[PDB]
Each structure stands twice: as structure tokens, then as C-alpha cells.
Design a protein around this ligand. Structure first.
Ligand SMILES: Nc1ncnc2c1ncn2[C@@H]1O[C@H](COP(=O)(O)OP(=O)(O)NP(=O)(O)O)[C@@H](O)[C@H]1O
Ligand SMILES: [Mg+2]
Ligand SMILES: [Zn+2]
Ligand SMILES: [Zn+2]
Ligand SMILES: [Zn+2]
Ligand SMILES: [Zn+2]
Lengths: 193, 353, 250, 143, 278, 353, 278
């Protein structure tokens, strides 16, 4: 009854991590995680691949109610052994959909100034990575500027364009659609165009 | 004209071959066996097991043989091998009250329940080089007494039942594990003890000696030193009930330390704890003394010696890191030294004119 | 609107040690002197309002921003760029192993200065301002005298042209001549640059010539406050009358 | 009583010397087909000790631990967790645990295998206690 | 192919996963030292354990690995690390920077400019640029947290006042993304400019100190200096005695006791390219 | 009623017999020979010789065998035996330029006159436990090159001839001997070096590591490490001319340390020196680093770490004294502890009422 | 007779001569710690090396040697030292204080008063009474030189203010000849009065610390105290359970885990005398 993880966990995890590193180090670049044929629905291929690559017993995982399913939870526990937490503030990795609320977004741990790596990484499943409001990205990982038009919630666009949190505090966003992934670290400066 | 040639790999192989040949020594003499090192060099094995982090006498003896007797190299070998092994279980908390006693002494009372059990020790021996060991000899035939192990309650339990000391009480706090998370200062006492057990014997000995000489005095008394076999038990998920997996030879040291006068309770002795693999005791005693020294924040003590400096003591206690970083100076550094030479030559030229 | 606002501020080490129920407003371009008995809590209050001591009660608002509700980074930025702090003992506000030039230039570089020559020139200018010879710029403060160290600290905390300066007996250790020089410098900064100063002093003459408003503190409570000359010449609370009667007439 | 008896015989097997256990098992000549559910695996058991022996827990290093699992034809599962790195000893211990879980072998092995091993261990302990007790310092005798 | 009996790259998947999370965090916080539970490697601490762990966590089967120490591939420790990685991963290896996908270096950045998808991994003994100023981590953590870098500026000012120049000639502190002060590893001042807006990702591993920090591609990296004392790189009056280059970092080779000496490129691959061009 | 009985002597004899039996181990295994320890555990022998103060490999191996591998106990055995031996002569000053080189490296230049001679070393080895050593094996057949030892001038001589460093110059001062006169702080550099050579390897390693981490930084570079055989010569009164008495395997380490800018001469590198018996190098490197740290008074350096504290470093460096004083807590202390108990009970009673 | 193959008393004549000169100097300067070139003994440092060396330098063939540790002759270390001295000198030994010519003790002075021509040698771990106040010898040397003992008085005053009593219960500092502050070795306060105007010579040896100091016979030794806080010795509500004495220092023997305990004389010879009297 449980879902299936990577056919080759070592090689597949390494490939997925390299793709995610390419995405995060170069914000706005879309990468494809083709190693996993099928995702743990409602989780897409990219989200499942990221969870398998990074999540473990040391990383609490919070799943939004739309994405919280018994089969998904059991598969995550069996394959990664990552504890599941019902509150976003207890999560190292947060998985949500377009229905994420501002309260949930603001409840995510942003770390602290002395330990800015203690915050949560938000995995957001977007309807598409391409058909939304044009966004100009500048900052580390971007030579001049990157034009990406992800379809995003308004709380997420607010987070990106305003940056309420003072660096080094922040949330790193991972926009997943199907087998394709985009990364926006807390450093990236985002302007609506 | 000069042309670059490959010399690194063959030189490295030749150096390793030379080291191996020196380790083997004269082929006329029979090669040392790991069992011989384990049995007849048991104290070096104990130190290697304690500092390397694996309580396997055979592995420690193998590391000592591979290290040509170098304790630092053997300890690093054992630690690196620890990295390659998976963690199968976490043992249930050890119960030192159930130790089978090879040795048990107390310096705070002339006699105690269970008696003063000297056991195997070099204490009180006249350190005169025994040249008869240059040739094979016959081990002494041991005399015997009754075989019952008399009850041996911990001396600190006796002190606490009198109100002179405080029981060490378990609040259920999850111990910190510096083998998975890097230490964060100030570290908890669990982390401090874990690091001290892995710390260099000589460095902690020197720090404890300094404390004994006023550099952060704690007025120590060897309340009790117990060496013997403790059973190790686990609770595998397959069965769900405790299973005993064997016994480990360990040494435990409890130090009574200068009494305090807390605002809202009777004055009482403080305490320090040390725990090591094997029969070696001085490491455990130094561990207890340095633990008491580092307990200063919990008592609001004005530090008067480096042994009370938590970051200084712990950041340099692990001989693995210290030895590696000191030996890394042997690595090529001509790029950095060339930078310094360029700066220095410019400074000399500037000062000359 | 006040540059600094203090409301019901209280910090007590023990009953009677510290300050309790202290409130006052400070505007740009004025001096609020604090006078009182040795042991009234003047230094504790100065530390609390300068972001160096978290209060047990009350609030402090700087430019409408609660001082201690802000992040520690923001308070350190304030103390690093636009806040000056002059300690009673100069070495407490100086780097012992750093030359006088370095002590003055740390603040300048913290404000964005990155030209060594300009920083050196500004440090020498401020040393001459407090009448310290410019040839002592490279000498460590340990070689300076008490008055020299105090003046070096004053220059260090005034080089950045700050907007708010908390001083604890800045005239201590100063001969009357350099004291008058310092008073003129502070008056000029306050009037021309709209600087605000909270000064704790026991020399009531310096408070008369410098402070625009006064607080009189005793056993951790503000006993009398108001216009400096009104308080000195028309005291109301018994302590103030004792205090001004104890002045040595020259 | 099954849990306590299983714990006792597993402890006896774990504390048994590999050589004597192998010799006794060969002498018994027990015919039983089993499949190794988990090949003997040598890893580490993390050691937890207590401050002052009774206080807060802390990690006092690690120790080598070998674990093995076998299955008998009837589905009985035998397990072994033994300190050290002797894989064959762990496999034997798991096999003996599986056999002891069987009614036809429990009594026979208790009378012929577990009890002699425990008696030998107790004798070795008794003897070393006699040798160690000679170093006891006598101070007073109650006359 | 990996046939050494160990797991691919010698690290268990848990350690790889933890190091990967640390790398992602470091990329998200450029210049910040991310603590990580580093393990003891077959090499002693201080001999490149952090870089080895980073390479093991990032290296794949298709990667081409270049290992250089002091800019030379034939350096003893570089040879040892390359042989270890060949044994435990079986990956392809090259001495050519432009053919390499992963570059593990000690104290040098190759003269050849790096390209996209390339990762250069630095071996860092001291990941804290303020360590030699403040030896205690308890203080440097807060100083980085609160951007209290004034002590570094004071140190530079005092160096200029005392010697007339900044005394730091290698591991020269840099400012990353205008915010974090970072130690670039003991590369000479010569290689610091290469870090600015570099198309290749930069990863830094201090295994003994248990720190990982990264500089993403196309990130501002500015060496701390003054307008009237601008950042200046090492210079030599002699070109390379082998290839004749004048734009490469030079190591000094002493030929005899009399005093004869020569200067040759530290980057052996660049020297080979330059000699084969002419 | 109780009556006192004699138990001390027989208990001591039984404990010593138990320790001897444990040292011998299982009689099935052959007893270890001192030659085997000397040849195949050469690094432990080197440390024992260096810290114990006698450069006799056989005596150090005998002490290790008698100490059951305990380095501290073997070192103390060798030192105590040193006490029983008469001083027949004082050697002429050693000339390390005449060393026959087993190993010679320099981290400050890529290549130097004489080349980088790695020699026998564990450096660059992959520390993986070699389980094939559990059984007897065949030592590698060593490859060979030309037999000429190329000229190997000291790197510091090259630096000094360039003006980048200062020659270490002999003023004829009589060296201080802490083996005959107790040290008086501040000690001269000769006394400091003599004590450091006898100091605990681990303690000095930790101090040097702390210096490397900013606790009294000195910016070290391994200018040159030379291991090999040096001839020892004396001048007996019987003959009146120098006679060569043999050769000693010694390791010398020269560390280049951060340059200074003296008022009346060009800026130059400072230096640190280490010298040990045998092939072990980390002890010599730590000795050089701590020597540089303790040279602070001669340079007017503001101490920033304990390693620069002369009295603290030297008063606790000798592992003989430190280990003895830490282990002395095992001695009976019930008289002193009874005094403390009387005081503590009175304090508790006073506070209760 | 000495038949062990070593020199009489195990020490070479040069070391004996140096120790003898040190002893004479110490006698001439009561309470002053005389440095001496102590040698490593067969016993570890801290186990009585200084006392052993003093006895070896002073002991003769006709001497009767009594060795006590904690006041007991049968104590393990006392037995070891006595056996060593018998082996290397062959001298007569006794457990009776009045029959002994040389008494080497650790942490006790015998209850039996000493007589003329008797020498009692103390094993001293810390010869500096100010060490626990000032750990550095560089400062304590000057403090003794200049009679700057104010810190000790401050320590006693602070102890009285904090606990209501002086916290030092053993090794209680004393004033010798009205001038030097001396550590009496870790004897309890109980034994300090015995040191005042003692007919027997007192010698103190700290081998590890390399110090020898002496108190000549009939020399004033006054424990530091205050008029309103006079020097008070340890007391017990129970007499000795063996002999019934009430004027002897008592050691506490724990009989069982329940809580039963007894008190018996630390001085075993005095207890034997007292039991044989009644
Ligand atoms: N760290 C402290 N701990 C406990 N009590 C303190 C502390 N500091 C001050 N007290 C008391 O707090 C009261 C006020 O302290 P403080 O503010 O420094 O006085 P002050 O008015 O500035 N005296 P002066 O410097 O002479 O003008 C005094 O009774 C102090 O003794
Ligand atoms: Mg004040
Ligand atoms: Zn280095
Ligand atoms: Zn070239
Ligand atoms: Zn003691
Ligand atoms: Zn009695």
C-alpha cells in the first residue's frame, strides 16, 4: 500500500540534490528532477524527490491539510523516517499548496540572527512555474536579473517583494510544479513587473 | 630550463613502504600479534578505546599495532573506523551499582562497606626497572580469598543519606550528542562529560593538576574509584524487551569537592564524575576534576584558572583535532609563505629607504 | 516630538538599589542634566536609557520606536552610529590595546568612512578640539592620563556627530581650562547641530552652564525636576536644598 | 515466564565465550534447517551512562555490537545482539534462541546447553573474585 | 566504478543528507558559517576533511574531479585525496580546470576562469575571519549575528598605522553580498578578485571547526580595504621561468645553498597551457 | 568490639601480583619481548625516551613492557631509573647540520636544496584499520634510489642569508639545568626548552593548537623538520680530545613565526625550536610552537592565551609531577576529610537553628 | 644491613649533601621554604617523595624509623615506604613513637609527645601556605620576602564573615618565630598545637614542589586566628570505640550501608597504648 521511493536512492538523491543546488544557487532557474517517475499524490514529483533527498529523522516535516494524506504520511515515515508535526512552527521543511495562508507563512520558523540556518524551508506546490505575474529577480545567483512568471499566492508574493524579515533571517522557497523545481532563497530581491 | 615532473605518488608510496617496514622491524624477531598487545599492553588499549570512542579491545590493539605504538595515531584510527560503522542501538543507562568489582577504593574513609579493594594496580609499587623482564619469566601464582563480592554501596550514597552531599538526580533531559551536532558553548554538563571522555589524557591531567595547585581550586577528595565489569543492555524494536548484550570493563571515579553554602539549603559537598573504558584511572580522575572545574557557571564561581574556561578547555581537549591541526603544518604552505615573504620584503625595502 | 521618551522606567538590583518610576522627555538641541547623591541610581538610569540595561518596567521610545522591543542588532546599530556613550571611567569606553587614533576612527569607519587619511585627519582634529596634542594619536590610552583618557573617550563618542549622547560625569578628571573648552564644545554641538545630551554630573556649575533642564535623583526616585536655574536657585524638595547648600563657593 | 526465560537464555548466550559455545553446539549435533533473516551485521551500540551513576544521562562512547536474525522452518524467529565483532557467534546465538523458542528443544537445551554455560561463567567469576578478594585491605575484626 | 567495499563517496547517506542541507542553507545565507555534524575522515583533521566531506556529498558518477593543493595537482595531499576519491567513487579525474566539474582546492583558485555548472570546493582550516582577532566562538557568533565588524576595521587601521600596510596577505577577509564578513580560505590576496561575480558556485568546508559556508554564483565579494590603501595583489619582478607568464601566482623554488632561486607558476595546469601555447 | 588487624602489606602484595598477572595476560600467548616493543612500537618508545629523559630505546621498551603499555607509568619508570645513574660526561653541543637524514621536509618552499625527503611517515596515509595485521604478513620489499645524501642546508640558514630571519647566535651562556636546580620563574629560554622536551605531549599539543586558534597566535610555518641520526661526542678528561661515542636518532623542528618590526633593524621572522628523541614529530612541533609562545617577554607581546603564561605552562607540563599528584588522591585522605566533615556538620547545625 | 645493590638510603652522596645543606639553611631560617634539587624517587610525586628524600639524607644505621600515614603504621603507603627504607638501609623499625628516632609522617603528628633528639619528617604536597590564595610562585616568593601576609588575613576575615568560621580545617597556616607564615603539611588543626615549642626537630619536605623547610626545637608556632575566634581543634561527641580515649584525633569507620559507624583513634600506636593500659 505504501508508495515507492527512488529506484536508486544514492544516485537519485545525489542527482536531485545537484539539481536543487543549481536552482538555489541560481534563483529563478528551473530544474527538472526526472529520477522519480511518480510522486506521492497529492505531492508532485519534485516535492517528493526533495523530501526523499533531504528529509530524515532530524528534519520535522509539516504538511498542509490539502497535502496531508495518510498514504503520503506513511510513505514519508517508512522511507525517510522524518517526524511529522501538525504545526508549521515546528517544521524544518514545510509543504503547502496555493491555499497557504498568511498566518501559516508567518508561523514558519525564520531562524535567529546567531543561527539563521535554524529556520524552515518552504516547499510550495504551484499551479505552474510560468503563467503568473512577471517577476524580476536580482541578487546572489543572478548576474543581472532573471525574469520568472510563477503563479504564486499573494502572501508568497508579499513575502518575496517586501521581505518582512531582516537578513540573515528568512525562509527559502522551493516552487514545485510536476517534475520541475524553482528556488528563491531569502537573499533574492524580487520586483513585480 | 626546468620541466615539471611527477614525484608525489611514488614518493608517497615509498614513504608508506618505509613506515610499514619500520613498523615490522627486524624480520628475525617474530611479528607482534594483536592479542599480545591487547593482553600485555592493556592500559594503552584502555586509553585508545576511551579516546577513540569504541570499547573494543581488539580494535584498539589493532590500531596500536598499525600505529607503531603511537597512541595519537591509534586513537585517530579508531575514531575514523567509528565513522564507518552504523549505530545499531542505544544502550540503556549504565548501572554502576551492578558492577562486578575488580578494584574499589575510597580515600575519604579508612574503611567502608565492602572494604578497600585494591585489585590490580601499580599503586604503591617501587618504580624500579625490572630487568628480569628482558627475558621470559613465570607469572606469579595468585593467592585466593573467599569469592563473595561483599556489598559495595557508592560512597556518595552514604554521604547523601547523611545530608553531606546531594544525590545526582535524573530529570529525564535528553543528553546532548556532540558526535552528531557540533558543540555550542556554553555546553551542557552532558556534552562536557562526553567531550572530556574523548579528551586528551595528558591535557586534562595538566588542567586538573593546575586546579590542584590553586588555578581554580575545587578541594578534591577521591570519594570512590570503582573498576570492573558492567553489563550492557539494549531494547531492540524487534522484541520490545531488554536484552543483555555483554559486559564492558569500565572505571568510574567520584570526587568530593569543596562544600558550598546555598542560600536556601544546608551547606553540602559538590561533586565531580569521571568514566572511562578499562582499568586506567588517572583519565577518569582528571575527567571528574575538570568536570567540577567547568561546573563553575552552575555555582557562580569566579574563575581563577584556565581549567574553568569552558571554550578553551573543550575546544582543545580532543587530541584528534589538535594533533591533526598541529601536524598539518607539515603540509606544503609555500603559497601562503610566499605571500608573507612578498609583504615582508616590501616592508624591509620601505624601511631601508 | 521628543527625540527620547522614558515612561515609568524602573530597574532595581534590590529594594532601594537602582531607579524606579522614572519618566522624562528629551528633545533635539537641549541638555538634560542629572544630579543627585552618590548612590541614587543615576548611572543605572543612564545605562537603561542607553540600551545597556534592560528595565524591569516602563518603556523607552527613540524616534517613536520602543528601544528594547527592537532587535539587538538595531540597538547595537544605534550605539554604533548615532548614539554616544561616555562612561565615568574612560578606559571602560576605550580600547586599551588600540591607539587613540584607532579609538576615534572605529566610530568613523562604523559610519561608512573608508579613507585612512581622512579618518586620521578627523582624529587629529578632534584631539586638538579637546586640546590633546596631535602627536599622541598613535599612543595607547594606557599611556594617557585620566583627563586625557576622558577627553579621548569624549572625542570618540562625538566624532560621528551623534544625535544623542549619554555622559556620566564627563568633566571628572579634567582641569578647569579643558573643562571650559569641553563645555563650549558641547554647547556649540547642541545649538548648531541640534545635539541632545543626557549628562550625569556632580559639579552643579557645569550643570548650570550647560544643562537646559535638570533631574534631581535620590534613593532611586526623581525627587525634583524642571528648569535648571529654577531648580538650583528655587529648590523645593529638601534634598535639592541640601544639595545646593553644599556647593563650595569660589 | 516466557519473556524472563528468553531474556535469561539470550544473556547466557551473549556472555558465553564463542569457542565453548561452538564446541558445545557441535557436540550436541542439533539438526535444524534455518534461513538467515538478517545476515550478521557488526555496528555500534551507543553507551549511555549517568552522572554520578544515578543522575542525568550522557553518552559515554560506543561499543562494537553484532546482531543476527535467523528463521526456523516453522517460522520461529531467533535473534542475537552480542558485544564484539564475532559474526558466527551471533548467528549461533540467534539459532539457539530460535531453538529455545521451540517446545521440543527448550528443556533439552536448558538442561544441556544453557545451564552448563551459566555454570561455567559463574565458576570463572567465582574464581576471579577469589583472586581479586586477596587484595582487600583488612582494618578491623569484630571479636 | 566503486569497488572499495565502502559506500559511494565513503560517507553514509545520513551524513551526505545533513551536509547537503547545510550546503543549501549556506547558499541561502552567503558568507555565513553553517554548523554541521562533520565526521572524522581517513585524513586527519586539518588536512582537508571538510572539503573531502563536501565533495563526497556533492560528487556524482558523471563528475570530473580535479584536486589541487597549492595550485598543483601532483601535490602530496592532493594526490592522496584524488586517490581516495577514485577508490571510493571511481570518478573520472583531470588536471585541466576547464574540463573539471568539481574542483577541490587548498589555498589557490585556478588562473583559468571558472564556468557555469562548475563547483570549486575550498579546504578551510579557520572558517572565522575574526578568529585571530577574537579567539572565542561565543563572541564571534554574536559579532556576525549583529554585524559587529568594527574590530576588523580597527585591526586594519592599526596595521596601516603600524606597518603602513595591511598585514594580512592570505585568507584576506572579504564582504559577501554586502553583509557577511567571510574568510576566503588561505588563498592569497591574488585569488580574492576571482571570487567576485564568479559564474561557478563556491563551497567552503572546515571539517575540524565543523563549518560550511558558500558563495553562490554571481555574488559580490569585495575585499576589505580603504580608498587610499586599495586592495593590491602579490607581485613579482620575475616571470615564470618555465612558461614566462606574468599574470600568475608564483611559487619560489630554491635551487642551491649559494642563493640561486627561480619562480614558477603555482597553477601547474595554467603553466602547462601557457608553455604549450608558446 | 573491634580490634585492629594487619592488612596493608598482604593486600599490597596481592594487588601487585594481580597487576603482574594481568600484564602477562593469557599464558597461551607468548610473552612480549622488549626487542619486539622496541622495533614494532618504536613511536611509543620515542615518546617514552623523550619524556623520561633517557635516549635508550631498550630501556624505554622495557619500561613500556613493565607499565603494561601505560606511557605515563613507563615515562616515570625511566625518569626514576635516570635518578639511579651517574653522570659520566656532558656531550659536546649537537651539530644537527651533520645529521644523517631519514626524513627532511619543509612547508615554506615547494622545493629546497636537498629536496623534500618524506622518509618513513604515516602522513598522507588513509587511516583505515588494516585488519590484515590481525594475522602475520610479509613486509614490503623496499624500492631503492641512489644512495648519496644530497646537501641539506637548514632552511633557516637560507632565510637568514636573505635577511628575512635572524641567525640563532651563541653568546657562550651556560645553559640552566632544571634537573639539578629547581626552576625559577621567569625561566631562561634554555630552561624553558629543557622543560618542554620533558613536557607532556598531549598538554603541549593542546597549547599549540590553542595558539593556532588565536589564543596567543604566532603565525607558524613548518620551516623545516629533520629526522635522522646525529653523532654524539664527548671530551673525557682521561684523553683531553673529542671522542665519538655513537649516534642518536633525533627529530628537529624549526618553525617560522610571525615577523616583527624592531625599532633599529629590518623586520624579520621570529622562530621556534623543537628537539626530541626518535621519529615522533608532533612533540617537536608543539615544543617549537610553545617555545615561540613563551618567548613573549623577549618581544614585549601582550599575552592573549594561557600558552603564553610561563608559570602555568611549565609548572604543569611535566606529566610525572601532574600524574603523580592527580593519582595521589587515591591515597587515604580520611584525616583531612574528617576535619572537613567536622566543619561541615557544625555549619549545617548552625544554619539549621 | 643494606643488601639491595643500591647506595645506602638509595640516594647518591651528592643529593644527600645538597639536601643536608638545604636542611641546615631551613633550620637557620625557620618557616622559610628552601628550594632544593629534588630527584625523582621510586614513589610517584605527591606520594611522599620529599619526606623520603629527607629521611634518606638524615637516616643512619643506628636510627629507629617509624613510618605512619594518617597516623597508622599499617597504612599502604606507610608500609611501602617502610619496606623501601628497610631494603635500602636495613634500619630498625618500630611502631612506637617513644622508641623511634626518626618519624616520617603524612597528615598526623603522634599523640605521644616527642622528645629530644627525635626528628619528625612531614610529607608536604603544597609547601606554600598562600598557594590556594595566590597560585603563582612568582608572587608568593615576593610576599614571603616582604612579609606581605595581608592576603591571608583578608582570607580569614572573609571566611569568618561568610561562614562564621575559618574554612581551613587542615594544613592550617601557622606563624613561625613570629616571622614566616608556614604550611604545617595537611595535618589537622588538632595537631597544630603540638608544633609549638616542640622538643623534637621538625622537617618538612615537598619533593614535587622542590621545597624543604624546618622548625627547630623549642620554636614558637602560633596558628593564625582572632581573639574572638580562637583556634579550636576538631572535636567528637564519641570516644574511641576501641580504647575509649577522648583526647585523640578520631577517624570515622563506616560499618554498613544502613548507617552504622564508629570512631577510632587515627594514631594506632596511641590506641594500642591506651587499650593496654586499660
Ligand atoms: N551591580 C550591582 N549589583 C547590586 N547593586 C548595585 C549594583 N550597581 C549598583 N548597585 C547599587 O545601585 C545603586 C545605584 O547605583 P548607581 O546608579 O551606579 O549610583 P550613582 O547615583 O550613579 N552613584 P555616583 O556614581 O557616585 O554618582 C547604588 O546603591 C549602588 O550601590
Ligand atoms: Mg554613577
Ligand atoms: Zn596552515
Ligand atoms: Zn608558468
Ligand atoms: Zn591530598
Ligand atoms: Zn583508641
Amino acid at each position: 500500500t505504501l508508495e515507492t521511493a527512488f529506484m536508486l536512492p544514492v544516485q537519485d538523491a545525489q542527482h536531485s540534490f545537484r539539481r536543487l543546488l543549481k536552482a538555489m544557487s541560481e534563483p529563478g532557474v528551473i530544474v527538472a528532477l526526472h529520477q522519480l517517475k511518480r510522486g506521492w499524490q497529492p505531492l508532485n514529483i519534485a516535492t517528493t524527490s526533495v523530501l526523499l533527498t533531504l528529509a530524515d529523522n532530524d528534519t520535522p516535516v509539516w504538511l498542509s491539510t490539502p497535502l496531508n494524506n495518510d498514504i503520503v504520511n506513511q510513505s514519508l515515515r517508512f522511507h525517510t523516517n522524518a517526524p511529522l508535526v501538525s504545526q508549521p512552527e515546528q517544521a524544518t521543511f514545510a509543504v503547502t499548496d496555493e491555499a497557504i495562508s498568511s498566518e501559516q507563512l508567518n508561523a514558519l520558523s525564520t531562524g535567529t540572527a546567531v543561527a539563521p540556518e535554524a529556520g524552515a524551508t518552504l516547499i510550495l506546490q504551484v499551479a505552474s512555474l510560468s503563467g503568473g505575474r512577471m517577476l524580476r529577480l536580482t541578487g546572489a545567483g543572478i548576474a543581472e536579473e532573471r525574469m520568472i512568471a510563477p503563479q504564486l499566492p499573494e502572501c508568497i508574493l508579499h513575502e518575496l517583494t517586501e521581505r518582512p524579515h531582516p537578513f540573515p533571517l528568512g525562509i527559502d522557497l522551493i516552487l514545485t510544479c510536476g517534475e520541475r523545481l524553482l528556488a528563491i532563497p531569502r537573499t533574492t530581491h524580487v520586483e513585480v513587473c | 630550463m626546468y620541466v615539471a615532473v611527477k614525484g608525489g605518488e611514488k614518493a608517497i608510496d615509498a614513504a608508506h613502504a618505509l613506515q610499514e617496514s619500520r613498523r615490522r622491524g627486524d624480520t628475525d624477531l617474530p611479528e607482534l600479534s594483536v592479542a599480545q598487545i591487547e593482553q600485555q599492553l592493556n592500559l594503552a588499549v584502555d586509553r585508545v578505546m576511551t579516546e577513540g570512542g569504541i570499547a573494543d579491545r581488539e580494535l584498539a590493539a589493532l590500531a596500536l599495532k598499525q600505529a607503531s605504538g603511537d597512541n595519537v595515531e591509534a586513537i585517530f584510527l579508531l575514531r575514523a573506523y567509528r565513522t564507518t560503522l552504523a549505530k545499531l542501538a542505544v544502550s540503556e543507562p549504565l548501572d554502576t551499582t551492578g558492577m562486578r568489582l575488580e578494584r574499589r577504593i575510597s580515600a575519604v574513609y579508612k574503611d567502608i562497606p565492602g572494604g578497600q579493594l585494591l585489585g590490580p594496580t601499580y599503586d604503591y609499587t617501587h618504580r624500579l626497572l625490572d630487568f628480569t623482564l628482558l627475558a621470559n619469566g613465570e607469572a606469579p601464582t595468585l593467592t585466593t580469598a573467599d569469592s563473595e563480592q561483599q556489598p559495595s554501596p557508592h560512597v556518595f550514597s552514604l554521604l547523601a543519606r547523611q545530608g553531606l552531599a546531594k544525590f545526582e538526580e535524573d530529570s529525564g533531559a535528553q543528553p546532548d550528542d556532540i558526535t552528531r551536532t557540533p558543540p555550542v558553548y556554553p555546553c551542557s554538563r552532558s556534552s562536557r562529560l562526553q567531550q572530556l571522555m574523548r579528551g586528551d589524557e595528558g591535557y586534562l591531567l595538566a588542567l586538573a593538576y593546575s586546579t590542584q595547585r590553586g588555578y581554580g581550586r575545587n578541594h578534591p577528595f577521591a570519594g570512590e574509584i570503582r573498576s570492573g565489569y558492567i553489563d550492557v543492555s539494549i531494547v531492540p524494536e524487534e522484541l520490545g524487551f531488554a536484552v543483555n548484550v555483554g559486559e564492558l570493563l569500565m572505571t568510574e571515579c567520584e570526587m568530593v569537592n569543596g562544600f558550598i553554602d546555598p542560600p536556601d539549603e544546608p551547606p553540602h559537598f559538590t561533586r565531580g564524575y569521571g568514566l572511562v573504558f578499562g582499568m586506567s584511572e588517572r583519565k577518569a580522575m582528571a575527567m571528574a576534576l575538570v568536570d567540577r572545574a567547568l561546573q563553575a557557571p552552575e555555582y557562580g564561581e569566579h574563575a581563577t584558572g584556565p581549567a574553568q574556561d569552558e571554550e578553551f578547555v573543550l575546544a582543545h581537549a580532543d587530541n584528534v583535532e589538535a594533533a591533526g591541526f598541529v601536524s598539518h603544518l607539515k603540509l606544503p604552505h609555500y603559497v601562503d609563505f610566499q605571500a608573507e615573504l612578498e609583504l615582508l620584503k616590501r616592508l624591509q625595502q620601505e624601511k631601508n629607504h | 516630538q521628543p527625540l527620547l521618551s522614558v515612561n515609568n522606567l524602573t530597574h532595581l538590583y534590590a529594594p532601594g538599589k537602582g531607579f524606579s518610576d522614572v519618566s522624562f522627555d528629551l528633545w533635539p538641541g537641549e541638555v538634560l542634566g542629572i544630579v543627585g547623591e552618590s548612590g541614587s541610581g543615576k548611572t543605572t538610569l543612564l545605562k537603561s536609557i542607553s540600551a545597556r540595561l534592560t528595565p524591569q518596567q516602563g518603556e523607552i521610545h527613540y524616534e517613536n520606536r520602543s528601544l528594547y522591543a527592537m532587535s539587538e542588532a538595531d540597538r547595537r546599530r544605534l550605539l554604533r552610529t548615532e548614539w554616544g556613550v561616555v562612561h565615568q571611567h574612560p578606559l571602560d569606553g576605550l580600547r586599551r590595546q588600540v591607539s587613540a587614533g584607532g579609538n576615534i576612527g572605529e566610530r568613523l569607519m562604523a559610519t561608512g568612512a573608508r579613507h585612512y587619511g581622512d579618518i586620521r585627519a578627523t582624529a587629529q582634529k578632534w584631539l586638538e578640539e579637546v586640546e590633546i596634542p596631535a602627536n599622541r594619536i598613535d599612543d595607547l590610552p594606557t599611556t594617557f592620563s585620566g583627563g586625557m583618557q576622558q577627553r579621548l573617550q569624549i572625542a570618540r563618542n562625538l566624532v560621528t556627530h551623534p544625535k544623542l549622547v549619554f555622559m556620566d560625569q564627563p568633566t571628572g578628571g579634567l582641569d578647569v581650562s579643558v573643562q571650559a573648552r569641553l563645555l563650549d564644545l558641547l554647547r556649540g554641538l547642541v545649538v548648531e547641530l541640534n545635539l541632545a545630551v543626557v549628562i550625569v554630573t556632580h559639579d552643579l556649575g557645569v550643570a548650570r552652564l550647560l544643562a537646559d533642564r535638570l533631574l534631581v535623583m535620590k534613593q532611586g526616585q526623581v525627587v525634583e525636576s524642571g528648569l535648571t536655574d529654577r531648580v538650583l536657585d528655587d529648590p523645593h524638595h529638601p534634598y535639592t536644598q541640601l544639595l545646593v547648600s553644599s556647593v563650595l563657593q569660589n | 515466564a516466557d519473556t524472563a526465560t528468553r531474556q535469561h537464555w539470550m544473556s547466557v548466550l551473549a556472555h558465553s565465550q564463542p569457542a565453548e559455545l561452538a564446541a558445545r553446539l557441535n557436540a550436541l549435533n542439533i539438526t535444524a534447517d534455518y534461513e538467515v533473516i538478517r545476515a550478521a551485521e557488526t555496528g555500534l551500540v551507543q553507551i549511555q551512562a549517568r552522572m554520578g551513576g544515578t543522575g542525568e544521562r550522557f553518552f559515554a562512547g560506543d561499543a562494537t555490537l553484532t546482531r543476527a536474525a535467523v528463521r526456523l522452518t516453522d517460522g520461529t524467529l531467533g535473534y542475537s545482539w552480542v558485544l564484539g565483532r564475532d559474526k558466527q557467534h551471533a548467528e549461533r546465538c540467534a539459532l539457539i534462541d530460535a531453538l529455545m523458542q521451540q517446545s521440543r528443544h527448550f528443556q533439552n537445551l536448558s538442561e544441556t546447553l544453557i545451564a552448563p554455560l551459566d555454570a561455567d561463567r559463574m565458576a570463572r567469576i567465582a574464581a576471579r573474585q577469589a583472586e581479586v578478594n586477596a587484595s582487600r585491605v583488612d582494618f578491623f575484626t569484630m571479636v | 566504478a566503486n569497488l572499495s567495499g565502502y559506500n559511494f563517496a565513503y560517507l553514509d547517506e545520513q551524513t551526505k543528507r545533513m551536509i547537503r542541507r547545510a550546503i543549501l542553507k549556506a547558499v541561502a545565507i552567503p558568507g555565513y558559517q553553517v554548523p554541521f555534524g562533520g565526521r572524522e575522515m581517513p585524513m586527519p583533521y586539518g588536512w582537508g576533511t571538510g572539503g573531502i566531506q563536501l565533495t563526497a556529498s556533492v560528487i556524482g558518477e558523471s563528475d570530473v574531479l580535479k584536486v589541487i593543493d597549492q595550485g598543483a595537482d601532483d601535490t602530496t595531499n592532493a594526490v592522496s585525496i584524488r586517490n581516495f576519491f577514485k577508490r571510493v567513487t571511481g570518478v573520472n579525474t583531470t588536471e585541466r580546470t576547464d574540463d573539471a566539474t568539481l574542483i577541490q582546492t587548498r589555498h589557490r583558485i585556478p588562473e583559468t576562469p571558472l564556468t557555469e555548472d562548475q563547483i570549486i570546493i575550498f579546504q578551510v582550516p579557520i572558517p572565522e575571519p575574526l578568529r585571530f582577532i577574537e579567539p572565542r566562538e561565543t563572541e564571534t557568533r554574536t559579532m556576525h549575528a549583529l554585524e559587529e565588524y568594527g574590530v576588523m576595521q580597527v585591526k586594519l587601521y592599526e596595521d596601516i598605522a603600524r606597518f603602513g600596510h595591511i598585514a594580512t596577505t592570505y585568507a584576506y577577509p572579504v564582504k559577501v553580498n554586502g553583509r557577511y564578513v567571510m574568510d576566503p580560505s588561505p588563498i592569497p590576496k591574488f585569488d580574492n578578485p576571482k571570487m567576485d561575480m564568479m559564474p561557478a558556485l563556491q563551497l567552503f568546508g572546515a571539517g575540524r571547526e565543523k563549518r560550511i559556508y558558500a558563495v553562490p554564483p554571481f555574488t559580490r565579494v569585495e575585499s576589505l580595504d580603504f580608498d587610499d590603501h586599495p586592495f593590491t595583489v602579490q607581485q613579482w619582478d620575475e616571470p615564470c621561468a618555465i612558461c614566462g607568464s606574468t599574470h600568475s601566482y608564483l611559487d619560489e623554488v630554491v635551487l642551491d645553498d649559494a642563493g640561486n632561486r627561480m619562480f614558477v607558476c603555482s597553477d601547474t595546469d595554467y603553466c602547462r597551457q601557457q608553455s604549450e601555447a608558446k
